[PDB]
Amino acid sequence: QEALTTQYSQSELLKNWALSHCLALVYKDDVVKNDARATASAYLEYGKQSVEIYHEIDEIAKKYSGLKYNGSISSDFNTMKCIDFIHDRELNELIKRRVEK
């Protein structure tokens, strides 16, 4: 089955990249990290933006990936860091501002 990768708009690709990249940062397991990295690379392929926009998305991702989240159940809540990240106002403004539409 071919994935939906070619159907995403430029802004949607960048948001998809942001999410998969963040997941690649937060998870320890090599198979999961490599999968998230491979997935992010698919969204980069179809982008029309220079590499520095992804470097800047990473700068914002690191503000979330380095957080310590706690709860009344046992977990680091790594997945949650990336879900909070993809709602970040700075991230969404960065994407909307972009020079390369």
Partner: protein, 157 residues
């Protein structure tokens, strides 16, 4: 009235295990949802077990989300719902403490609710308290990252 402290404490112990084990113990829709991974916070399910086991069962038509066990009794699965359920069924609280510490509850026993900030999955916790320790102290992960704002005790006789 209210569950006896002794019966409540005994019943809590039966489910003072991992959420997976709680699912096995209770079975039915509780078990199915735990096996499926939908429920991971056993807190309100253990409190539901206490109420069901001590002769104060959660009514089918209580205005809170709940699922049945193999016993055909009902189990509330949200912390916020369990807190609200107790507020509406337990009568007047016996102690309400702003910015509570464990020492504030010494010498009295029953059902304790703590609401506060710092947890990413809940606004608070509900458990039993015997005057010295909580019934799930063994799971109580943490001066922790949770900052208690309000603590409420309903004494059990």
């Amino acid at each position: 009235n209210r569950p006896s402290f002794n019966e409540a404490w005994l019943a809590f112990r039966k489910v003072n295990h991992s959420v997976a084990d709680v699912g096995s113990i209770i079975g039915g829709n509780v078990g199915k949802n735990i096996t499926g991974g939908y429920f991971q916070n056993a807190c309100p399910i253990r409190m539901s077990y206490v109420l069901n086991a001590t002769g104060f069962p959660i009514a089918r038509n209580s205005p809170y989300a709940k699922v049945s066990g193999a016993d055909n009794k009902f189990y509330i699965y949200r912390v916020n719902d369990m807190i609200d359920y107790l507020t509406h069924t337990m009568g007047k609280p016996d102690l309400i403490v702003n910015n509570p510490k464990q020492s504030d509850f010494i010498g009295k026993k029953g059902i304790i609710v703590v609401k506060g900030h710092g947890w990413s999955n809940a606004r608070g916790h509900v458990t039993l308290w015997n005057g010295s320790i909580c019934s799930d102290q063994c799971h109580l992960l943490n001066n922790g990252p949770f900052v208690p704002e309000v603590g409420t005790l309903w004494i059990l006789p």
